[PDB]
Every structure is written in C-alpha cells, then in structure tokens.
Amino acid sequence: SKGEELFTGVVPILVELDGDVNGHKFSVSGEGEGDATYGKLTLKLICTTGKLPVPWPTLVTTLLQCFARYPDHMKQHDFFKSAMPEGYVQERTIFFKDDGNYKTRAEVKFEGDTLVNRIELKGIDFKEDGNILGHKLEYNYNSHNVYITADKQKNGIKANFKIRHNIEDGGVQLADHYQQNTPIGDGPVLLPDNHYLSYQSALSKDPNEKRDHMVLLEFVTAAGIT
Ligand SMILES: [Zn+2]
C-alpha cells in the first residue's frame, strides 16, 4: 500500500504559516500528531509574532487531510496518502461573504518521519471593523462535510464547501472554500470517485500558555459512497 504504510501509526506534525491580511503580517507555528487509523489530528498552534490579527477560527481549515480515516472499502479513493512521501500542494481561495478573501498555498510532505505543512496566506479586501479584522467571531466551530471530486486534467482533486463561523452578537459569517490539490512528485496517485470527508473540530486553550494560540482536535472520516 504505496503511501498508506506511512500512516499506520502516530505521525509527528509541524505546521508553519506565514500570513499577511490587509498588510498585517503574522506567523503561526504548530506541533502535534496525526493518527490516520482513527482519523485523528491534534495540533497546538502558536502565533509567534504576538497578537493574531484575525480570528483563530478563520485559520482552522488552513491549519493535513492525509490523516483522514478512509474505511477499508474506500482505500482506493485516498489521494492524500497516495501522494506521500513526496507530498502535495494544497491551494485554497476562501471568500468571506460581505468581506475579504484568503488565498493559501500549502506544501504538505514528509521531512524524515515528520509530516510538514509549509503554508503561505495572503488576505485582501477586508473591512477594518468587519467580523474578521474586528475580531467578532466566536471561539468555536461547526461540523461540516467536504465534497471531494477528481480533477483528472490536473492529476489531483478539488473540493468546494461552505464554513459558517458563529458571530458573537448572533448570526453567521459564511466562508466559501475552493480547494485544489496537486501531487509534488511524478509518482502515480489515486484519483478518487466523488465522496466527502466528515469533519468534527474542537477548539480549546492550553491554560498554561500566555502566547496567543489555539489547541485543535479534529476527527475526519471519508464517506459518501452511495
Ligand atoms: Zn469507481
């Protein structure tokens, strides 16, 4: 099982994100582990530049779908593991309704025994007292299904999905996600049948940590084979 063998145990994870939203620069550094057997991802993400100038929930989708649990019946549809260890590029555009947009490029690959995600994020067209730069989003997260389809012509996959962020005063901030993933290698990859990834996301704090940070626990399971 090419790539899948790399994910049979607990894999250490490093995340490094360099961000600029409306000219406000920030870096995020993350450490944790992934246990694909259980679809389990645990990360502690730290803003190393001081105060994060956007809400932590707006970066959850950006901050390792190779840790999704594909049931045994669906192992032929797992593109993300098939691209390893050479890895893949994930690009997203995220449009916040009635606000700005994020454009992200991430390179997901192994460095020795460690799965690394090097991410660059650029945000433009935000309102200074909107929900994002105004910090008006709740520190919580809704379950959602991500529909995956083959992009046969780009030897990869695509996905589009809607995230609803809870606004403090009540109401929801829509974030429309458009995603493409392409392998880094010329190694063969699995191009899947349509399916979805079911996400459950839990956000918390390390009570001992004084820097601006997010503890992220997520469980991701492939489904949607009719
Ligand atoms: Zn088929």
Numbering used by the authors: 2 to 64, 68 to 230
Question: What do the study authors state?
Answer:
Venus is a yellow fluorescent derivative of the classical Aequorea victoria GFP protein. Amongst the various mutations introduced to generate this yellow variant, two key changes are the introduction of glycine at residue 65 (from serine), which is thought to influence chromophore flexibility, and tyrosine at residue 203 (from threonine); Tyr203 π-stacks with the chromophore causing a red shift in excitation and emission into the yellow region. In situ synthesis of the chromophore is critical and occurs through the stepwise covalent arrangement of three contiguous residues Xaa-Tyr-Gly (where Xaa can be various amino acid residues), with only molecular O2 needed.
To incorporate a photochemical switch into Venus, we replaced the chromophore residue Tyr66 with the aromatic non-canonical amino acid p-azido-l-phenylalanine (azF);34,35 effectively the hydroxyl group of tyrosine is replaced with an azide group. The most significant differences occur in and around the chromophore (termed CRO). In im-Venus66azF, the backbone carbonyl of the strictly conserved Gly67 is twisted ∼180° out of position compared to that observed in other FPs (b and ESI Fig. 3d, e†). The O2 molecule lies between the twisted carbonyl oxygen of the Gly67 and the hydroxyl group of Tyr203 above the plane of I ring element. His148, a critical H-bonding residue to the mature CRO, exists fully in the open-gate conformation. A channel leads to the chromophore in im-Venus66azF that is only available if His148 occupies the “open” state; when His148 occupies the “closed” state normally observed in mature fluorescent proteins, the tunnel becomes blocked.
